[PDB]
Amino acid sequence: VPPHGELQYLGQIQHILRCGVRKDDRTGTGTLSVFGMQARYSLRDEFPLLTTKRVFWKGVLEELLWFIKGSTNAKELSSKGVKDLGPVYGFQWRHFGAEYRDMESDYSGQGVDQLQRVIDTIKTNPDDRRIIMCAWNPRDLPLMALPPCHALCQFYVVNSELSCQLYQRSGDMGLGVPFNIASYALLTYMIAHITGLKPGDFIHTLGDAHIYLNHIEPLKIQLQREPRPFPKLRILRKVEKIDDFKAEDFQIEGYNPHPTIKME
Amino acid sequence: VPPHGELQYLGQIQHILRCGVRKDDRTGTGTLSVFGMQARYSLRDEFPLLTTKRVFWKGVLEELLWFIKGSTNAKELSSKGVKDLGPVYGFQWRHFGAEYRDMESDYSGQGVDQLQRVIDTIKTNPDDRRIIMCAWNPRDLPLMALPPCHALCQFYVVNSELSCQLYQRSGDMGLGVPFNIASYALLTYMIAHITGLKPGDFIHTLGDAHIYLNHIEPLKIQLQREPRPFPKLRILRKVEKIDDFKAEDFQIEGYNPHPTIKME
């Protein structure tokens, strides 16, 4: 280019199963879909890493750190242990609107650094209503002129607390949502850390909220599992720049999830 | 560049009053604010024109028709009886990304026609997850490079029904929200009409949902009013082009609202 927060996710799954309508996706299989959903996860002295199934936290932290450095090299992520990709979210977050060339091209000072702009705006005017960052699906870029974004994050500050609202055009409830809740909650913790603010709430809003048919049986089982109190996220070191964050700087404490659930 | 749907709005007002936090806006006065809200209004055999106060339907229909013709001339709206404005929503909806000149300049074939693209995409692929249109606040355009949008509409189709989700960066709950609910519900009715689909749901999602302090007393009173069944919207004529719609083509039936409420 207070009830356990997890209950909302479980309620949404249950709602899609009973009320969702069959709808085909771009490619793959059919889904059960509902349009328009929203859930709020408190980030106050607790982290929304879902417990009704073991979430791949290692992949969340590692993928996010990869996006922050604006690296578009998959080999730089696959090595970290999580398994030229083009203008991925990383390139978009730090070099928005530039012009992608290669994974080795230096885009220093090229394009708008949406991420730094968010941090800068939080510092220059916490009341600002335009603290927004957007991401596109790489495959849409060459498809048309001025294509719509895939997701957007809006930040909000009040009473020394930072909140974030993620709006996603579509959400794969079985495989994608649990992971993304952790990803953006984490991003919020990071930004809050460097702007001297305390994490507030993470609001997850979806357009086409859907469950792939091959995930129905596994989710029905996940629904029988009672949530365990959410863990906590600790930032061991004091960081001043969003680029100075390292995986070793974060530590999940008290995470007691139910067994892993494989979603095809 | 089933409970009355209105109860959600009333519930949101009540929630902001009791839990909202004081937060100052760009210019004006203080507000009570809550970040992250969502409400769903069925458009099936009923129209969400709020009844706990008389909504200015004449202004809604007239303003929307003005946006559709992409006119940026205020005199063209003030004459209709609703009371060069620059790249307003109208210009953005039909000539996105062009380059604004004057209110008399011909932008035929200039910029992306987001509105027609939405209608075209609904016809070419109803399952598409990118049926999105965006609007910017004119004042932000010259403020920075690639400024964030102010609102976005995402359309969704399934079972021959068209739904729309409006995401607004911020919502003035007392004066703006009731009006906008009608505006976008109407847009959905129009698009559905020309694409041969039936209106589904209208989802209204907000970022900074706020109540201006000078609206607190009036809203407290509005809250004591019991909603009356929503009216119906009838499209008297058969239209094939979104540009062929005329005010005389719409008729609100059964609208029985409580007295008008003045919001400063």
Swiss-Prot record, chains A, B:
EC number: 2.1.1.45
A Pfam family matched in the record: Thymidylat_synt
Protein family per UniProt: Belongs to the thymidylate synthase family.
Catalytic activity entry: dUMP + (6R)-5,10-methylene-5,6,7,8-tetrahydrofolate = 7,8-dihydrofolate + dTMP
Enzyme class: transferase
Annotated binding of dUMP, by residue: R26, R129, R130, C149, H150, R169, S170, G171, D172, N180, H210, I211, Y212
Assembly information from the UniProt record: Homodimer.
GO cellular component: cytoplasm; cytosol; mitochondrial inner membrane; mitochondrial matrix; mitochondrion; nucleus
UniProt-recorded name of the protein: Thymidylate synthase
Residue positions of the active site: C149
Subcellular location as annotated: Nucleus; Cytoplasm; Mitochondrion; Mitochondrion matrix
Extent of the signal sequence: none
InterPro entries attached to this UniProt entry: Thymidate_synth/dCMP_Mease, Thymidate_synth/dCMP_Mease_dom, Thymidate_synth/dCMP_Mease_sf, Thymidylate_synthase, Thymidylate_synthase_AS
Clinical note on disease: Dyskeratosis congenita, digenic: A form of dyskeratosis congenita, a rare multisystem disorder caused by defective telomere maintenance. It is characterized by progressive bone marrow failure, and the clinical triad of reticulated skin hyperpigmentation, nail dystrophy, and mucosal leukoplakia. Common but variable features include premature graying, aplastic anemia, low platelets, osteoporosis, pulmonary fibrosis, and liver fibrosis among others. Early mortality is often associated with bone marrow failure, infections, fatal pulmonary complications, or malignancy.
Originating organism: Homo sapiens
Keywords of this entry: Cytoplasm, Disease variant, Dyskeratosis congenita, Isopeptide bond, Membrane, Methyltransferase, Mitochondrion, Mitochondrion inner membrane, Nucleotide biosynthesis, Nucleus, Phosphoprotein, Transferase, Ubl conjugation
